[PDB]
Amino acid sequence: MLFKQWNDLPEPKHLLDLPEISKNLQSLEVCPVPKVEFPQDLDVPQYSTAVITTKIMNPLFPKNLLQLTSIGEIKTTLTVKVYGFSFPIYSFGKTLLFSMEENFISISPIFGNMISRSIISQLAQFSPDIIVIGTSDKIASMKVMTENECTLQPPEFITGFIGSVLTQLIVGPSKGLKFKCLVAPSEGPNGFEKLSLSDMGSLVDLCGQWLGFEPSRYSEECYRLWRCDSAAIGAQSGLYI
Amino acid sequence: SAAGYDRHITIFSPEGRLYQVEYAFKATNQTNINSLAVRGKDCTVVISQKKVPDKLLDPTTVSYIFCISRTIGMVVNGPIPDARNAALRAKAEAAEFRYKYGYDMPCDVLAKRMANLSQIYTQRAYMRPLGVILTFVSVDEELGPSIYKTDPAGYYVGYKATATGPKQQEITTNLENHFKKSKIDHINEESWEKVVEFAITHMIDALGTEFSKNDLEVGVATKDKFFTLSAENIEERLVAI
Amino acid sequence: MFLTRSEYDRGVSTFSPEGRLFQVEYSLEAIKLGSTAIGIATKEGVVLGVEKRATSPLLESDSIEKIVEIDRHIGCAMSGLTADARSMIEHARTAAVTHNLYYDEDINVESLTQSVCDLALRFGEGASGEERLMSRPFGVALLIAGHDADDGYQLFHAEPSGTFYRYNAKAIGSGSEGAQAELLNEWHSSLTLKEAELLVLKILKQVMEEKLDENNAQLSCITKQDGFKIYDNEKTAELIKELKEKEAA
Amino acid sequence: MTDRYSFSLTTFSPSGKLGQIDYALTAVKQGVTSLGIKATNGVVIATEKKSSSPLAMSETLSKVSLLTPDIGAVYSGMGPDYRVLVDKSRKVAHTSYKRIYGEYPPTKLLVSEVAKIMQEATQSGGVRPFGVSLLIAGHDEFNGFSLYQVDPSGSYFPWKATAIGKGSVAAKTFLEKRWNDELELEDAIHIALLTLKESVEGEFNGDTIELAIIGDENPDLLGYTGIPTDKGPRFRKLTSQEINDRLEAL
Amino acid sequence: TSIGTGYDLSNSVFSPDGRNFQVEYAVKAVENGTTSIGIKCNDGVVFAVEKLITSKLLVPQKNVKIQVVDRHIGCVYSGLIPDGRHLVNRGREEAASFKKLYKTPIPIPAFADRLGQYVQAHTLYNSVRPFGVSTIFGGVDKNGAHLYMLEPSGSYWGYKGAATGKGRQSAKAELEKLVDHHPEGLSAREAVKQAAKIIYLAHEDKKDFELEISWCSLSETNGLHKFVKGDLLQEAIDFAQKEI
Amino acid sequence: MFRNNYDGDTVTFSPTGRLFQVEYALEAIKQGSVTVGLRSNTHAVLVALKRNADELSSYQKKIIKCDEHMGLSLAGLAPDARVLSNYLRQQCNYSSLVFNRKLAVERAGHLLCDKAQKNTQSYGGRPYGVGLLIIGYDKSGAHLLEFQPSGNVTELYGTAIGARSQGAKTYLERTLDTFIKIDGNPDELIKAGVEAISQSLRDESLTVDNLSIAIVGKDTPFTIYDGEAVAKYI
Amino acid sequence: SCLVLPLVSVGNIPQLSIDWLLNSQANEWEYLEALDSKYLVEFVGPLDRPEDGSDSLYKDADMKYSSALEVFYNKKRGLFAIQQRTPLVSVNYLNNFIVEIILPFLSKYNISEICIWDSLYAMEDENGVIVRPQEVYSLGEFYFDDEAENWLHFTPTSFKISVDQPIFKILFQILNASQRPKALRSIKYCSCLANEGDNSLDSQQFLQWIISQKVIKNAPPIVKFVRPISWQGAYGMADARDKFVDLYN
Amino acid sequence: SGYDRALSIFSPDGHIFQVEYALEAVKRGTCAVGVKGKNCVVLGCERRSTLKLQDTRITPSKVSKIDSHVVLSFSGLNADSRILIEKARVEAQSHRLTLEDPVTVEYLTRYVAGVQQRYTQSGGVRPFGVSTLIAGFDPRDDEPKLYQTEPSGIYSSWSAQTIGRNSKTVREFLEKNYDRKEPPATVEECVKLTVRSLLEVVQTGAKNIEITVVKPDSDIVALSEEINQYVTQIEQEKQEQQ
């Protein structure tokens, strides 16, 4: 190229381009807070294990093999002088599952914060098994953490809905809970992240170990779910080799 | 400091200033080398201070004085890469002028040509000015001894005698005092050796220091040719005075 | 250690810190917005099936044509942006006609697919050192079917990334995942032409929000004897009726 | 691709103003004052020759340049831009008029060409607008004497008398109070000297003032004798001695 | 002042102090390269490179760190390998053109000037980046032996002794000590021994290393650039080990 | 965090003196499968593990023939790999047709370095993100070259690139003297390469559909075995 | 009695200065408490320690993680310092953050001083609040005793304030609050002009200027500048350069 | 958002925002309706209220006759529409010269879409903010042809389509009143349907409705006052229904 455009100067990266809630940038007034409502008929004590993750980890939970069933949903509403989304909750065996759908284009992090607070408040009454599955873009390799040991490097950190859940578990209103967290490296914006084959395999192996299933069938089903045009893989087959 | 798009290209600031040109002027004086040019009755002398802080460097390879053509010599203040680039451009321009117009290029016309190139650099967005100050010295057949100087801004002008560098103000003041004392506007010596000795004494008085044979670089322009004095000639001049 | 915005997914000629090109991934995401297109290649020929997703009732049935004829021995189906697909189809037809003119023979399907992938690679450096002709990569995925003496019946999937694969049965579109799973679980080499057509219709009805009918379902076939042809509405309706009869019992 | 074009360097502000042109005007207003006043039988152009460290030769650098034997110009702003514009104006005057009609162009047409060049500069994505303002004084057979002012935007206006640069408002007021319809060339020169005397901060001698006149023909400056129809230059530059003699006198 | 924010994202931008920060960043990249030194004896030039012992899978025959431009020109560099290799290729093209035109080997100062012009031309536009290599080259011509070092800015100078890389500073001191020990002159074999000694002194980082020494002298190699043979190389290694 | 401000293009250097886009291009290699290359004295062998999108997809053509005496295997980005393979084919044909001379392996490596270095210093182009393993035989014997897309070429007896290639490289380095003296029996060299590439497998085994072999030699023209042809080698 | 509240601004100079402030002298600073972060993008991270080999600010041994919005306390000089890692969600939630998070913290510990650190980009100066670009830093002061019911007074520095700037809304909410503390007396505002990039040295010089101006009453001088260990990972792996042998040599 | 400042940038969800912004600019202009009859095509357009001091003698017609058998209407920016119409007429004449056969409706629509696509392939150009309706008959039969072309270069075939501001109401009216099984057999029925559809959004149908009728054999008759008669008859029938 003879030259590059003079006006092609990037904007400062200090502020993220998060979606706007209210069109009034000079409101000078308190902004309304989203309201979250947890079902009152979920019967939490009937289940002794709850898993909190996002939609990207759907291949880790095959439907037919685990016998997923629907019980109730979390309703989130917000009024601005209009946002409303449905959060289904699944159940396999005796274990509940929350899989929030992140979308940095249309869904603000405040909804995720409210949902995480509601879920942690509801699940802290009985203290079941807590398993956190998520991804961070600042970690070099896969990380396994518990409530007593932090394996993250000083530069590495976890942000997002999983980060909100971990914050509520550690320094939130409800403390003392025991949790196991599995974090895998990823790239991309929230709700559109991508993984690698090795990371997917490691996640599948660790999930199978922590869920108690035969490695052969579990791995076969997980691989079939990954390769069936899953959004997490992306274009690994079409871009590399 | 600059603010906006006027940091990488040459456009007007809100105060009507070109910051890149001023920063190139700042870059010119980063070599910490001072030069002097004085015209005699039938000769012109340029003397540049030579610094060799490193004894692992060959002194004979350090030179900011260039022979543009048979009669024109050039002295550059600033970094040596842009100095050599300007030297090659000046050589090409002088040769092309001689080829196209049938007679040797005078010093003022070459200075104007370089100034026009500098103006191109200062107006074009994708081109940058050369952070060097050029001084052409010759003995023109129509104007006698001639010293002309051009800067990154595209401004050129002739001088009775000139000084340049970080400590140019003291040398300029001493030259003005000498001219007021004599009121002939040039040097009365009829031999170029005497003019070189006078320039050496003036530089010693202005800078308040004594030089060796390796601390000076002298070029003399006569009617027929411009030649750079060697170490032995400078030593002979020092021994004489 | 602070949260700052990352801009590695803006420029096409920019690598992610792990070495990925997010523009191609976004192009695939755009392709996912297109309607479902299915292609099944068996020893009796290749079958293509698309859904005519009509945004308005007054839209013409023949307006939407996502199954084209690259050549008498090469048919194509598209999913994604129609604008880029038009240029890709025109280039493929031009290449086929030029090959016929200069060689007096039909072009192999693999050669045509490679040519289309070379065209799709134009957003960067060309295959033969050619310069850049596209500001952004394509947003269309192609299913190319054909028949030739070298490899019998061939079916290929071509991506904007410039890499193509050979598939026995490939479905890409809005309902790509479910159709792909059904093809993986319900395919065998003993499928006949009728069985493949019925399977395509059943999968389309499975992955369609509205009721299946010939208005929003186009079926085309390519065989050695009759080249490439597209079934009309009457034959598709008869096939749908037969599928309903066989699924009832 | 992203190499065959460049975005426009001059763009409109939300208020409806071109920022680069305004900044060029600001740069012009920071330059040395240059003035021009028209008489009934001539035009006077004057400027102050500001200098660097007093070792340079002021005669080598001239801020008043002959465009055509009957048309001259002065500037306020940036020197190299003025020099480039002067060279281009001389070349355009020769190519467009002298080589076509056999005659030098009138003042208005040359001013229009210069304004067109400057406007093309302001409409480009590769160069910034020029940073000079030009006072052009000329004479032609069918329009007599004329004085024009050209701005960095390419807008030119006629003037009976005007001034640009640092001391422009005060000079404009003084010239308005001094100019009259019956003024002559000597009175115009005297008024121009008086106006310059109020703006120079240093020595007000002939070595720091550049003055030119569009007066009558000068057969002694033609360079040859023998053709009565041919006339000498109508543009003359006053020497230092003449300026000093006028300064000592009224 | 080593980090100029706001004036370091483009190649050809002057900072308010009047500095080009891309050039200084290229210099910083050079400072992280391998140590290479060059010495000038009475009638020749010696180059020494301290290389890291890589995997044994590499062929120890075709892998040579010191680059050859022309029969009388030797060259080493520190920085980025692709940039140095491209610069060596350009130098080879220039030498070939000069010899093809004027029927004589290109003089060292002319070669240095052409290389400096080519390197400096890459600091004039924002569509290119400066080379991230410092190059120590030299040779023998009709005027004698010449040794030059060229910086990423395009500035080149002639040196009695030049050093670059991680262990440059101490090496330079050793080079200065050499000038303080042999002011009158130096022979080629003594130059090889001292180059080996300086490389051994300045490689104390640890990971085993290897030494590569080449020389070009009129009275030892008939004015040609040749690598030091096994006997003299082993002698130099033994001398360097004994000196420590 | 401070790296994010200096990784926009290949023209920008970090304050510490880094070129991050080229580093990312190099890191893009490990996203591809594993390929191994090795030669003793007269034959050069490439072994490649092929990958498929799913069950119904075909397998990627890891090894592509460049000329009767030269071939390569690719690991990394498919577009850059195809561009460089076509470039090498064109260069071999150009050398043969113009100079009446077969292209040398070292000359091909120099050409690849020249082409790759240009995109690392000029704006408007993306650096290549594919590594190559080239095997050839010429008048100087058998040669194996590893080409790093930063613009680097190394000559070695054996190596391996791609995902999980560290185990194969360690095995090759440990047993270097075992296979470096295999002269005149290409089958042993091919089996040694297969054993080397089997060390990089993780929860997978070599089959008849995901293994490809390429062999060149003195009297053996460059040939490629795939499918049933490699069934004898398991 | 003095509170330091950094803002997420251009170049993160305030926040980094906070990292300069705490880790330069970790003896006098200890972790105090984590505030509610419902209005942030709060993260979870490990502990951070000074590079010179000092004890971590988190004295308690039962905590191994960290949150975004945290408050550290200096009991020797009674200074509260806030640290934020993730930016505030949107711009219309500043009012809620002021009147629902830091509002209880005011009058929770009876703080008698507020200090706000900010960095402004000179390019986005739409309202032209900058009048003397010769200087780089700027200071403004406000007293409740000397003022009843733009509204600030600035020292002879580089620069009123723009209505769009966060500082104006912060001041409006602090003054107009119906739950404001009775012990709040003085508000001080330090601002710096700088560009985006590696602002470590810029942050250090900004902190030096703040200490020299004695904006904080109980701010001791710093004689040795020590970075947190996390800054060693700003460019990535510590030995990343050694890895690319083919690229660096 | 960060992914909307260029036409060559893909969004993470798979959208090009500049195309959407061009569509929004299109939806800002006056309405335009195209209806296909059994053997005729009707193009209706909405004219903004004419000012008192505006010359009505040479006021431009919203429907431009590209060729003796092909007409064009637009919605969006007027000057860009003029540029597109000029290019389309030049291309039609060039095709007639080159192949001795007048252009078909589909070919001309494809050419217009191709021009609009080409004006999206560079970062230094602004795409046309015009959506066009092309109507006519192929010059060898009596089959009506109506096409809609969008700024992105996408062209589609319709039987009754509305583009412009408040086009949802007219589209719903056409959906609830137009049936492809029984298209209006006569020209009068199609004209009445178009006028009634336009009246759903036009404040005053006496001076803000323009009707053009295209029939086979390349006739093309533009209705004058007659539109006022249709409006009055529709009002009378509506009041009779009341």
Numbering used by the authors:
A (entry chain 7): 1 to 81, 117 to 276
B (entry chain O): 8 to 248
C (entry chain S): 1 to 249
D (entry chain P): 1 to 250
E (entry chain U): 2 to 206, 208, 210 to 247
F (entry chain T): 1 to 234
G (entry chain 8): 2 to 150, 166 to 175, 178 to 267
H (entry chain R): 2 to 224, 226 to 244
Paper quotes:
The multicatalytic properties of this proteolytic machine are provided by the subunits β1, β2, and β5. All active CP subunits are initially synthesized in a precursor form with N-terminal propeptides (β1pro, β2pro, and β5pro) that are autocatalytically processed upon CP formation.
However, because these densities in the unsymmetrized late-PC map differed from those in the C2-symmetrized map, we analysed the sub-dataset using cryoSPARC’s 3D variability analysis and obtained two distinct conformations we named late-PC1 and late-PC2. The late-PC1 was resolved to 2.7 Å, whereas the late-PC2 was resolved to 2.3 Å without applying symmetry during 3D reconstruction. The most striking difference between the late-PC1 and late-PC2 is seen in map densities around the β2 active sites. Although the aforementioned octapeptide is located in both halves of the late-PC1 and late-PC2, another distinct density is found between β2pro and the octapeptide in both sides of the late-PC2 and just one side of the late-PC1. We conclude that late-PC1 is an earlier assembly state than late-PC2 and that the octapeptide represents β2pro remnants. An unidentified density was observed in the complex with remnants of β2pro in just one half of the late-PC1 and both halves of the late-PC2. We speculate that this density might be remnants of β6′pro or β7′pro, which were cut by the active β2-subunit, as it was already suggested in previous studies.
